[PDB]
Design a protein around this ligand. Structure first.
Ligand code: BYE
Ligand code: BYE
Ligand code: MG
Ligand code: MG
Ligand code: ZN
Ligand code: ZN
Lengths: 320, 320
């Protein structure tokens, strides 16, 4: 739990290998980030509270194949990478940086392993509790502030009330923004503002922060093929658990979750080409350095999966 | 326990004296409304479940001076009056009517007597659960469907799932629409659609139903003076209870809830001229009969409060 200076240097890049570490180790990396970004400094975060809070946050993540503490670490680490790559401290206030990192760490708190569609279709407590309005994201966010409501885990204890309101409002906006059901909507608002972006316009900045946490949340394919690939299997593993249960309970099943229809290759080709690449393209208009560091590996991921599908076709064709 | 034909007859007019009845008589009036509007008939509502349900609903309303079961009966009874006054059954499907009546009855379920501003500023469990997004309305709605989730109270048990979904979505929209913080937004949207209203445009109808339930929710002043006045004192009783708690907790207090600034007269004059009259005025442009049966008493109510203000100001000079 004493990060070597080599690790501290690789922790700033999207190439970081998130699979090599264990909870304890990742917990230290996260702790490092808060000190390194000077958040501990500028918000008078009690360095000890920060430690408890991170274990507080860790305990509240479930052992799902995909939506687990490691996913949370990936998102926070990718966010951390982007703060350096795009020199976000020259554009954002320390408050926004805090919002971005805290939102990233807490965005999937207590995820059950079944998406909103299952919650809504099965009429779960979450769905009824949140009236079908992004039940999961709402829950994550609620769990996050319940944690910050425990004095022992309140890393925000030394922030004036005016600041807390601005931080809370910001985190809520960003966590709720990760519901993919809003992807098209958010992307449009953003592409619009982009026609004439203005870092002084508060709405532009909010959309930008919304886009940033969205990129980090689904940025797995931006990492090296060795690091990125296993995440797809973790996600499908979780999805199949849902589809089986849905089939069992007689609830509708989404095609991309049906073993007999989804193939890693075909799935990732469309995800990369129509969701990932386009989103990061919009961001590269503000941060050109992104094209080389994040779009590049995304183009390689796309091509790799396209070639990987030709192999699947030729192979299945060969069997019939 | 039974209703007289005179009562049943009067139940159709906004002049109905809602104070003359006890829970069991109100439950019976509500019951009659469902049979009379053809909702029991068109949705195969088990007549026994209808009564059980009305009871589950009653049991879940709290004994607040204002936000209690009688208030919910006021809203439902006014909605009922409007269905007749504006001949709503010629413009609305029976599903729309069901949504309107059931939403009006369930719109304030389990209200605590302290509004959203208190919830948010005091960081209560509700404001945390719903991330400061219309926490109360979200809660009322969830209780309504928790109630409907108990087979014995489920008046929708014989409605196919597609219908339930459409009714659920409709009820959620209407209940969340009662949060006055959204009053300006909704009125603007509606007035925009009013530039060329279209009864066949779905977005047009959703807004009209939102306006309708909002009209019923804050319509106390449309009723005869003797029936309306006591509600104002009831609301204020609840409001002072909040501002008292707010001052002795360090939380800000709403000027209109401030014992030292709010006078029944001044408050109602404003509420009547800048909220009520304007809202019913734009509604009248769609339903002409509304001007005489509802806009008229509101004008009277306004004039009476303006006179009461002069008297009030005089006596308060002396109390000094
Ligand atoms: C593998 C899925 C598509 C997909 N690919 C990703 O890399 C990725 C990363 N996150 N993420 C995701 C996770 C949870 C919810 C929504 C999304 Cl979008 C992803 N979804 C499937 F099966 F092909 F649809
Ligand atoms: C007396 C209040 C104004 C007011 N007058 C009403 O007749 C009325 C009816 N409902 N309603 C109301 C009730 C709950 C929440 C919001 C409103 Cl708007 C009302 N608020 C006060 F003190 F002047 F602000
Ligand atoms: Mg999520
Ligand atoms: Mg209410
Ligand atoms: Zn996530
Ligand atoms: Zn109400």
């Amino acid at each position: 739990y004493l990060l070597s200076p080599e690790t501290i240097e690789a922790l700033r890049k999207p190439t970081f290998d998130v699979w090599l570490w264990e909870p304890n180790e990742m917990l230290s990396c996260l702790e490092h980030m808060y000190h390194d970004l000077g958040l501990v400094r500028d918000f008078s975060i009690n360095p000890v509270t920060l430690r408890r809070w991170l274990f507080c946050v860790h305990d509240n993540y479930r052992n799902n194949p995909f939506h687990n503490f490691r996913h949370c670490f990936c998102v926070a680490q990718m966010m951390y990478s982007m703060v350096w790559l795009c020199s976000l401290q020259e554009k954002f206030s320390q408050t926004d940086i805090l919002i971005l990192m805290t939102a990233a760490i807490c965005h999937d708190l207590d995820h059950p392993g079944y998406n909103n569609t299952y919650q809504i279709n099965a009429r779960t407590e979450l769905a009824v509790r949140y009236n079908d309005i992004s039940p999961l994201e709402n829950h994550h966010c609620a769990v996050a502030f319940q944690i910050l409501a425990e004095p022992e885990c309140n890393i925000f204890s030394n922030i004036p009330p005016d600041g807390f309101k601005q931080i809370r409002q910001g985190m809520i906006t960003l966590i709720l923004a990760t519901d993919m059901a809003r992807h098209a909507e958010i992307m449009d608002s953003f592409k619009e503002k982009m026609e004439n972006f203005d870092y002084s316009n508060e709405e532009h900045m909010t959309l930008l922060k919304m886009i940033l946490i969205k990129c980090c949340d689904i940025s797995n394919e931006v990492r090296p093929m060795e690091v990125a690939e296993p995440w797809v299997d973790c996600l499908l593993e979780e999805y199949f658990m849902q589809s089986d249960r849905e089939k069992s309970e007689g609830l509708p099943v989404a095609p991309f979750m049906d073993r007999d229809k989804v193939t890693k290759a075909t799935a990732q080709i469309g995800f990369i080409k129509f969701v990932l690449i386009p989103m990061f393209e919009t961001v590269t208009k503000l941060f050109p350095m992104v094209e080389e560091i994040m779009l590049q590996p995304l183009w390689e991921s796309r091509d790799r999966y396209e070639e990987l599908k030709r192999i699947d076709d030729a192979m299945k064709e060969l069997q019939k």
